[PDB]
């Protein structure tokens, strides 16, 4: 019982302190952002200590704190799982959040509600560590929507903008469809396995979790923005650049993938579902990357590159490689977040313009950002002996050296080449070209907040994988006997992806007749996916609510069957009874009949 | 219970004899004081319910619901001294007379030890309510609304009355305890089926019911704000409370003759939630939203599962507190814009920052995100439904879709977006409005720490 | 003149007369006390004092007692060798089966 118990849990409660102090409203309402950042900085330094504790020995621990509920046989209690997955991801999540917080002080240094913004970031940050550190599935649920809802406000930061509300609403919907599988998964485990803690779920062998894992797969797909539900991530670009730089880059969108890593010991047994994640993983890599290259917004292109990445680890999830997928999260976290505020550095400096058509020549004009961008681009390509190499090439090497689906391999290989392809487009259009911005140039990065924030992630990205891979204990079996021509293909495929993409991109220099290729017309318009999903079903369900449902069913038919028909029947009969003639001759004639029927026909006499 | 019933009555002579302008202040403070006294019933033994006397007894179901009523009475009183201070003292005093009487019937109904005793005041709540909608309502269609509400619940109450007295003539007393201990398996004979319908339709017509939900848009939208909370927060639970109390002499006929009602409620909530997604009136959207949640409660009771009841009680009280708070939200705009169309007053976050926040966590609580007991309510029902049938989740979760879209859609349309140009009446939120709304959400969050109290008799 | 009626009275602003108006009552001093007394008899006396009341009641639903009562039964039951929980609660020996 070493301080490992206290240290990890202190990191969570320390993160709550800025929120608790903010609730006073007598708080540091002038320099709140600096107060928040230094708190995360303290927790980052503190959260290192549990790492080396696990690093030295491997002490994974369960902290079953205050007992909440005693549902019959089910005991719901706040419990944190200090697994290897939780124990090291917290420093990484704290590292990126610290890095951007300094950038957030620079980028939105003029927002009148900047203090409220920094409060939201901690609220999102808090919900994430709840998601990462969660034993019972209820806590996993707590962090799930808690992350999900916090994305809504942050995306709708500029609530005056109409489109931001649409994207914010769109993000909730696509994430909500994910929770259908999550809720389904919870119900099955509480019924069959009769618990929600990971301990019982793994012990109570559920090695035939066909529907539960399908629910788990659907939960990951919605949150991590795979195929089927991608387009909310590209539309999530409408929020502030820091919100894009942290949540949707490598902290919020990972949550869907991270669930599969947690449930790996039960996920591996079922062969059908792990082929489904190969199915979803392969298509997600292509379509996101395929739409990536033909885009123009810097934030869109970068985001599409992320959604291509989230396609990767689930491909690795299927073929008994969860830990490499989880390791892939770490390395992807560093450079992918980095690529955002470097683009954020360009965006704010060059008068908040996101169209790649309006930069060029920023290589010698923006030295540090140009260095940071190309470092991230090289890392993003798995180029050797860097952050990307220690994850991506091992992934591409492992995916081929296994009994998998053939069509998935062709897609992952093509995606990696396309992954480098749009990376050249970013460097070619944004930096290596003649300047195209408005005349009055204000580009500058000399602000220390911008320099230090990017530099920290720079020196992180250079080594990162080297330290982590050499340090974490062996947890899988690295295959060794394997021929050369798919050993080199981890780097071969991206060499062309650099090569012909450069040739096709520089072809714009030549004065040539312009012609929209049909495949480009398909790719550039997000593969036509929003124009059908976001228009056809949305129109039908809304129209069904008006024509049917509200009008036809509720207040036209349901209101006329029971209520109105009875009222009409009573009205007609009330007319019959009340409408008399006041004639004694007719009244007494009725009496005679009644006397006759009673004495003869009613048969009362007999 | 006499420690609550007598004090609740005692406000009526006091309010009728208080000073001219001290009516609201004096009534509110003792009304809060009574709710403090009613907090005493939260304790429940691990066994038989607290039976104070033959006249009154409280269980782990009545007590959480009872405190909701007593905690509610300050909320209508504190929500009504703005749209009634322009009326004479006597009519204002009469308004308190209805509200106090409305509570007294609710307190006695939820604590009735005899089934027929339950029936009288449970039905007798109509008279104080029917006055509220028809007298102090603020629209023309309120009169047709009053007829719609009164007749629709009376059409089911009478068959229950004939059913209850029939059980008296066949099984003796209908005391809740002796009924539970003296249980006879109901045969599948045709008469028992019709007896089953009589003992059930009275309560099932009362929450909403898909097909029998037409009175909520008439009543709730047209009712005065003080009343409008009650038609959605507590009396819908009267139709609820009856269900778990009466579904102990109907087993196992409820096992079979429940598919038409279960089928109507499951598909119905998807329809009525879809109504919310395409509604025009702010109050109607809230009222129809209450239909979907209440239909979820209807589904929950009809499986007779420990988990189902366990989340059933939590859902009702969680929904009741929320629906009241949202009806406070509709009132806040209603005083300023003097209209109920949603798109008339968009852009309130820029003008009213805190009122936008109050609209925020109110929407999330209706969103039923964890750990808010709305989630612990719905999620428990999902598992009970899932164990009953695996296809339920397809219908179960699809409701979570619609309840997500329209909840933020009501938020996004009103709060966010550009402020309405032509309005110049929106003033700073009165401290009454903000304080009232805090007294709604804060106990709702405070209940999240220990939902063991609200879980219900099955726990 | 159609009918003998008055025009719609213009809505009055409580802030217009007294900027310190809380929206509770029109008359200032009682309005100020209305805030003071629906708060005082609100959060502190009910929300705060009721919470610590409802947070520290005696054992509800006999939870703690049941667990400790259960634990001793396990300790006896493991020592013998028979299963930790009988599948027949009511003793079959004092049970009659109609042939």
């Amino acid at each position: 019982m070493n301080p490992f118990a206290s240290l990890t849990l202190t990191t969570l409660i320390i993160l709550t302190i800025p929120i608790m102090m903010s609730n006073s409203n007598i708080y540091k309402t002038n320099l709140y952002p600096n107060y928040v950042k230094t708190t995360v900085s303290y927790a980052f330094t503190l959260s290192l200590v549990p790492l080396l504790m696990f690093m030295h020995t491997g002490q994974e621990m369960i902290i079953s704190n205050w007992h909440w509920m005693t549902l019959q046989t089910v005991e719901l209690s706040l419990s944190f799982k200090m697994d290897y997955f939780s124990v090291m991801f917290i420093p990484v999540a704290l590292f990126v959040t610290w890095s951007i917080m300094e950038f957030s002080m620079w980028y939105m240094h003029s927002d009148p509600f900047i203090n409220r913004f920094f409060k939201y970031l901690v609220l999102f940050l808090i919900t994430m560590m709840i998601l990462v550190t969660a034993n019972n599935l209820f806590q996993l649920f707590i962090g799930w929507e808690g992350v999900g809802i916090m994305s809504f406000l942050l995306i709708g930061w500029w609530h005056g903008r109409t489109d931001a509300n649409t994207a914010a609403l769109q993000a909730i919907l696509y994430n909500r469809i994910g929770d259908i599988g999550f809720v389904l998964s919870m119900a099955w485990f509480l019924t069959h396995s009769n618990a929600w803690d990971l301990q019982q779920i793994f012990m109570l062998n559920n090695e035939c979790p066909n529907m539960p894992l399908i629910g788990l797969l659907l939960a990951a797909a919605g949150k991590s923005a795979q195929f089927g539900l991608h387009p909310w991530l590209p539309s999530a670009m409408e929020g502030p650049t820091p919100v894009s730089a942290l949540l949707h880059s490598s902290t919020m969108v990972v949550a869907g993938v991270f669930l599969l890593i947690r449930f790996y010991p039960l996920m591996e047994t079922n062969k059908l579902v792990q082929t489904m994640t190969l199915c979803l993983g392969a298509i997600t890599t292509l379509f996101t990357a395929l739409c990536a290259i033909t885009q123009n917004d810097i934030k869109k292109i970068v985001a599409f590159s992320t959604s291509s990445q989230l396609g990767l680890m689930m491909v690795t999830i299927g073929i008994n490689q969860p830990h490499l997928a989880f390791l892939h999260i770490c390395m992807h976290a560093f450079f992918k977040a980095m690529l955002f505020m470097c683009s954020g550095s360009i965006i704010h400096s060059l008068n908040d313009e996101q169209d790649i058509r309006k930069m060029g020549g920023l290589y010698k004009a923006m030295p540090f950002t140009t260095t940071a961008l190309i470092i991230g681009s090289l890392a993003l390509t798995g180029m050797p002996y860097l952050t990307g190499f220690y994850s991506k090439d091992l992934i591409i090497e492992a995916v081929n050296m296994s009994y998998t689906n053939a069509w998935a391999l062709l897609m992952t290989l093509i995606a990696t080449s396309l992954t480098a392809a749009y990376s050249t487009r970013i460097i070619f259009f944004a930096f290596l070209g003649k300047p195209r911005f408005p005349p009055l140039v204000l580009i500058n990065e000399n602000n220390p907040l911008l320099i230090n924030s990017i530099k920290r992630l720079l020196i992180g990205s250079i080594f990162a994988g080297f330290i982590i891979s050499n340090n974490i204990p062996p947890m899988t079996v690295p295959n060794t006997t394997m021929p050369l021509y798919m050993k080199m293909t981890a780097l071969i495929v991206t060499i062309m992806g650099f090569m012909l993409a450069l040739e096709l991109n520089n072809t714009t220099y030549y004065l040539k007749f312009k012609y929209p290729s049909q495949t480009y017309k398909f790719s550039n318009m997000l593969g036509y996916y929003p124009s059908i999903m976001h228009r056809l079903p949305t129109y039908h369900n809304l129209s069904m609510s008006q024509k049917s449902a509200s009008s036809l069913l509720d207040l036209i038919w349901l209101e006329t069957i029971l209520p109105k028909t009875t009222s009409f029947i009573q009205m007609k009969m009330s007319i019959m009874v009340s409408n008399q003639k006041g004639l004694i001759k007719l009244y007494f004639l009725s009496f005679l009949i009644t006397i006759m029927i009673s004495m003869t026909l009613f048969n009362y006499h007999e | 219970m006499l420690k609550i019933i007598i004090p609740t009555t005692m406000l009526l002579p006091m309010t009728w004899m208080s000073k001219h302008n001290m009516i609201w202040i004096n009534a509110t403070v003792h009304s809060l004081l009574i709710s403090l006294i009613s907090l005493s019933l939260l304790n429940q033994l691990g066994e038989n319910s607290l039976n104070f006397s033959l006249t009154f007894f409280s269980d782990s179901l009545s007590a959480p619901l009872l405190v909701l009523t007593t905690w509610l009475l300050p909320l209508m009183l504190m929500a009504s001294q703005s749209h009634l201070s322009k009326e004479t003292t006597t009519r204002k005093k009469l308004y308190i007379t209805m509200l106090i009487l409305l509570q007294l019937f609710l307190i006695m109904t939820f604590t009735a030890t005899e089934l027929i005793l339950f029936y009288i005041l449970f039905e007798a709540t109509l008279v104080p309510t029917l006055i509220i909608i028809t007298r102090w309502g603020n629209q023309t269609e309120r009169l047709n609304a009053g007829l719609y509400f009164l007749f629709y619940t009376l059409a089911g109450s009478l068959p229950l009355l004939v059913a209850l007295v029939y059980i008296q003539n066949t099984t003796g007393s209908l005391n809740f305890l002796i009924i539970h201990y003296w249980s006879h398996p109901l045969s599948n004979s045709w008469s028992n089926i019709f007896m089953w319908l009589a003992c059930i339709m009275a309560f099932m017509v009362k929450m909403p019911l898909y097909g029998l939900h037409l009175w909520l848009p008439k009543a709730h939208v047209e009712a005065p704000i003080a009343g409008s909370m009650v038609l959605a927060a507590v009396l819908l639970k009267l139709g609820g409370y009856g269900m778990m109390r009466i579904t102990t002499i109907l087993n196992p006929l409820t096992n079979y003759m429940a598919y038409p009602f279960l089928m109507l409620s499951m598909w119905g909530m998807i329809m009525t939630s879809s109504i919310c997604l395409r509604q025009t009136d702010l109050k109607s959207l809230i009222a129809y939203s209450s239909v979907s949640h209440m239909a979820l409660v209807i589904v929950a009771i009809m499986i007779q599962t420990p988990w189902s009841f366990m989340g059933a009680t939590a859902l009702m009280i969680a929904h009741g507190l929320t629906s009241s708070m949202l009806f406070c939200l509709a009132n806040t705009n209603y005083e300023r814009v003097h209209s109920r169309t949603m798109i008339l007053a968009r852009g309130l976050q820029t003008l009213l920052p805190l009122m936008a926040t109050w609209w925020l966590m109110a929407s999330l609580t209706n969103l039923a995100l964890p750990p808010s007991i709305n989630l612990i309510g719905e999620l428990f029902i999902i598992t009970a439904s899932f164990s009953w049938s695996n296809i339920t989740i397809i219908l179960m979760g699809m409701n979570m879709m619609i309840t997500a879209l329209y909840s933020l859609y009501m938020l996004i349309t009103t709060q966010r977006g550009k402020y309405t140009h032509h309005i110049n009446n929106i003033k700073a939120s009165f401290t009454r409005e903000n304080a009232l709304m805090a007294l709604h959400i804060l106990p709702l969050l405070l209940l999240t720490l220990n939902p063991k109290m609200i879980l219900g008799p099955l726990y | 003149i159609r009918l003998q009626e008055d025009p719609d009275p213009e809505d009055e602003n409580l802030y217009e007369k007294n900027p310190d108006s809380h929206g509770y009552d029109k008359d200032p001093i009682v309005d100020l006390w209305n805030m003071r007394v629906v708060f005082f008899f609100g959060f502190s006396i009910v929300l705060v004092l009721g919470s610590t009341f409802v947070a520290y009641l005696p054992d509800y639903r006999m939870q703690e007692w049941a667990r400790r009562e259960a634990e001793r039964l396990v300790k006896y039951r493991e020592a013998n060798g028979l299963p930790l929980m009988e599948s027949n609660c009511f003793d079959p020996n004092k049970i009659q089966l109609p042939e």
Binding site: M571, I575, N579 | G137, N138, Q139, T140 | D8
Partner: peptide, 26 residues
């Protein structure tokens, strides 16, 4: 203000019968 019945609402009650009919229309 709270809406109140008007003469058109009153004249609806003002007929010889609540529910008009050509027999009672005179």
């Amino acid at each position: 203000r709270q809406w109140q019945p008007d003469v058109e609402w009153a004249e609806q009650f003002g007929g010889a019968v609540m529910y008009p009919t050509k027999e009672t229309a005179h």
